[PDB]
């Protein structure tokens, strides 16, 4: 009885742990792809400033 009720919540938390980890991988790529866009826009700003001095 209470064992199956406890065993039922084990399967519920397992699928929740599954979704939480898959969401972490999507946010890992979001942070990484935003780190690349930031570096591309930082090099753009710096090259435009070095050009203005000419």
């Amino acid at each position: 009885e209470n064992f199956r009720r406890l065993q039922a919540e084990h399967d519920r938390q397992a699928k929740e742990l599954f979704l939480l980890r898959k969401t972490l991988e999507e946010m890992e790529l979001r942070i990484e792809t935003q780190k690349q866009t930031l570096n591309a826009r930082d090099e753009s700003i710096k090259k435009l400033l070095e050009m203005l001095q000419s």
């Binding site: 979704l19 979001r30 866009t37 591309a40």
Partner: protein, 74 residues
């Protein structure tokens, strides 16, 4: 926010939002790399005028990429 999110339904929607935002941000990265390249050759037009890298790039060629960036953000 994930703090106010609880349950299987709210998580599956939240994971879908993170996947859709990633694909739109990976498309933003590819467009930004084209803006960087176009800006590099734009600055070469003045810091290296006689160089082979001065390929005639103007600000309008960069603003054409700026218009595509504003399409994704819309």
């Amino acid at each position: 926010s994930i703090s106010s999110i609880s349950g299987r339904d709210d998580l599956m929607d939240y994971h879908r939002r993170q996947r859709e935002e990633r694909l739109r941000e990976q498309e933003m990265e590819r467009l930004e790399r084209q803006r960087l390249e176009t800006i590099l050759s734009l600055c070469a037009e003045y810091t290296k005028p006689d160089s082979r890298l001065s390929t005639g790039t103007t600000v309008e060629d960069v603003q054409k990429i700026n218009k595509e960036l504003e399409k994704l953000q819309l």
